[PDB]
Amino acid sequence: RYRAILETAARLICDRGYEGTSMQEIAAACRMTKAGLYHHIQNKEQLLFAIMNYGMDLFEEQVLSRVQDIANPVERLRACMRHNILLVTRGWSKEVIIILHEHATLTGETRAFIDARKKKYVDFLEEAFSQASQQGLIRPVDPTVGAFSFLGMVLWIYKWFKPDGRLTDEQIADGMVGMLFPPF
Amino acid sequence: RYRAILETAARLICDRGYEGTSMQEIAAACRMTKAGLYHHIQNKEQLLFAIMNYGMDLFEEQVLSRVQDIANPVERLRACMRHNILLVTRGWSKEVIIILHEHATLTGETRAFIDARKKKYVDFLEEAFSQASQQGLIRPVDPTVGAFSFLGMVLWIYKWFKPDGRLTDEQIADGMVGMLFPPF
Ligand SMILES: CC(C)CC(=O)SCCNC(=O)CCNC(=O)[C@H](O)C(C)(C)COP(=O)(O)OP(=O)(O)OC[C@H]1O[C@@H](n2cnc3c(N)ncnc32)[C@H](O)[C@@H]1OP(=O)(O)O
Ligand SMILES: CC(C)CC(=O)SCCNC(=O)CCNC(=O)[C@H](O)C(C)(C)COP(=O)(O)OP(=O)(O)OC[C@H]1O[C@@H](n2cnc3c(N)ncnc32)[C@H](O)[C@@H]1OP(=O)(O)O
Ligand SMILES: [Cl-]
Ligand SMILES: [Cl-]
Ligand SMILES: [Cl-]
Ligand SMILES: [Cl-]
Ligand code: NI
C-alpha cells in the first residue's frame, strides 16, 4: 500500500533521475493529487530517504539476514556474493541503483544515517575477509581491499548485465565466486 | 594551452556535473569571456566530447599502450591492473570520472565513437582472460565475467580511496592483483 508509493517513485527517480523528476510528476504517476501525496510524505528529500531505507530493508532481508550467521567465513563470503548478485540482477535493482546514483543528493543528516547502514555491510565484509585469512581459507589480503573488491565486482554488474544476454545471473554469480573465492 | 581549458572545465564538470555547469561558468573559471572560449571549442557537448577523448588518450598512453604487447596473458592482466589502478588514484582521476558519470550524456556519432574506444578496452581484457584460461595460467572463467570483474574492482576505487588514508595506491594494487591473478 504505502510501499507502492515508494516503489513507483523509485521507477521515475531511477530512469529519469532525481533532478529530472518533480513531486508533481510523481503525483500524476500515482492515483493521488499533488495535495494527497504531500499528506503521506514530508518533502522530496525525505521521499528519497524513504526509498533508500526501503532499499536497505530489502538488502538486509534478502542478503545480510540470510548469510550473517554462516559459520565458515569464506562460505559466508561466497553466499553473500551470490545473494548480492541476485539482488542486483532482478526486480529490486530499482532501489539499489537509487542508493548508488543518488548517494550525493541526500542532506548531511540523512546521508549519515543511510551511510551508517551501508557501513555495517562494509564492516561485515571486512570481518569475514579477516577471519578467512587468519583461518587460511583465502589467500591473505587486507580486509578493506577485499571488501571493496567484492563490492566493486558485484555492484558494477548493473552497468552491463542484460537478462536477455548470453549468460544468466546465476552463471555470472558462479564465475565471480570461483574467481574471488576459489578452493584454498 | 588547449589542455588548460579542458583540465579546468573537467574540474567543474566533475564536481558540479555536466548539467549545472554552463558555458558561462566555464568561461569564468578560465580567464576568458564567453566568446573567447568559443574561439577554441564549438559548443558544450563538443567540450564534453573533447574531455572524454582527452581522458581516453591519457588512459591509452599510461595503460593500454604500455601493457598491450606483454606476451604472457596473465602478466599482461596484472600489469594492466596496476597501471589502471594508479591512473584512477592520481592526477587524472577527474577525466576518468567524467567518462563514467557522463557516459550517457552524448548521443549519435560522438557517443558511438567514445563507446567504441571503451569497447576496445573490454575486448582487450576479454581476449587476455581467454588466452590465460586456455594456457592454464588462471583458473578457468568466462572472459566476459573476468573482464567486468576486473573493471568493477579497479574503477570502483574512485568511490572510496583517499590518498591520505592508511594504505597507498600501490599497496591496493598489490592486494587486488594477488586476489584476481594469484600464482596458479
Ligand atoms: C579508462 C576507462 C574509464 C575506459 C572505460 O570506460 S572501460 C568501460 C567502463 N564502463 C563499464 O564497464 C560499464 C559497463 N560496460 C558497458 O556498458 C560497455 O562495455 C560499453 C563499451 C560502455 C558499451 O555499452 P553498451 O553498448 O550498452 O554495451 P551492452 O549493454 O550491450 O553490454 C556490454 C557487454 O556486456 C555483455 N553482456 C551483457 N549482458 C550479458 C549477459 N547476460 N551475459 C553475457 N554477456 C552479457 C554484452 O554482451 C557486452 O559485451 P560484448 O559482447 O559486446 O563485448
Ligand atoms: C544494497 C547495497 C548496494 C548496500 C550498499 O550500498 S554497500 C556500499 C556500496 N557503496 C560503495 O561501496 C562506495 C564506496 N564505499 C563508501 O564510500 C563507504 O563505504 C560509505 C559507507 C558508503 C561512505 O562512507 P564515508 O563516510 O563517506 O567515508 P569515505 O567516503 O571516505 O570512504 C572511505 C572508507 O574506505 C577506507 N579507505 C579509504 N581510503 C583508504 C586508504 N587509502 N587505505 C585504506 N583504506 C581506505 C576507509 O576505511 C574508509 O572507511 P573508514 O575506515 O573511514 O570508516
Ligand atoms: Cl547461497
Ligand atoms: Cl545461504
Ligand atoms: Cl555509495
Ligand atoms: Cl561506462
Ligand atoms: Ni544462500
Q: How many C-beta atoms surround the C-beta of residue A116 within 10 A?
A: 10
- Nearest-angstrom CA–CA distance, B94 and B12: 10
Q: Do residues A77 and A129 touch, judged by C-beta distance below 8 A?
A: yes
**Grid coordinates standing for B136?**
592454464
**Grid coordinates standing for B146?**
573476468
How many domains are there within chain A? 2
**What technique was this entry resolved by?**
X-ray
Look up the CATH number of the domain holding residue B46.
1.10.357.10
Q: Which amino acid is at A133?
A: S
Task: Report the chain B residue with the minimal C-alpha distance to residue A119.
Answer: B160
B96 and B37 assigned to the same domain: no
- Nearest-angstrom CA–CA distance, B134 and B156: 29
B130 and B116 assigned to the same domain: yes
A31 and A48 assigned to the same domain: no
- Nearest-angstrom CA–CA distance, A109 and A115: 10
B112 and B48 assigned to the same domain: yes
* H helix intervals, A34-88: 34-40, 44-59, 65-67, 73-88
B34 and B87 assigned to the same domain: no
- Neighboring chain B residues of A144 at a CB cutoff of 8 Å: 166-167
A96 and A181 assigned to the same domain: yes
For ligand 1, atom 52, the nearest C-alpha belongs to: B144
Q: Which amino acid is at A115?
A: D
B82 and B70 assigned to the same domain: yes
B54 and B37 assigned to the same domain: no
User: Could you tell me how far CA A56 lies from the centroid of its own chain?
Assistant: 7
B81 and B139 assigned to the same domain: yes
A99 and A147 assigned to the same domain: yes
Contact B145 A19 (CB under 8 A): no
Give, for B46, the enclosing helix (H) or strand (E).
helix B44-59
Find the radius of gyration of the CA atoms of chain B: 18
- Nearest-angstrom CA–CA distance, B79 and B174: 11
B29 and B62 assigned to the same domain: no
A144 touches chain B (CB under 8 A): yes
Q: Do residues B40 and B61 touch, judged by C-beta distance below 8 A?
A: no
- Residue B73 neighbours by CB under 8 Å, 6+ apart: B128, B129, B131, B132, B135, B137
Distance from CA of A39 to the nearest CA of B (A): 31
A110 and A166 assigned to the same domain: yes
Report the separation in Å between the CA atom of A79 and the middle of ligand 4, taken as the mean of its atom positions. Answer: 5
Look up the CATH number of the domain holding residue A22.
1.10.10.60
Q: Give one DSSP letter per residue of B97-148, joined into a string.
A: HHHHHTTTT--HHHHHHHHHHHHHHHHHHHHHHHHHHHTTSS----HHHHHH
Residue range of the domain that includes B24: 1-41
Q: Which residues surround ligand 5, an ion (CB under 5 A)?
A: A 103
Q: Which residues surround ligand 3, an ion (CB under 5 A)?
A: A 79, 82
CA atoms within 13 A on the CB side of B89: 22
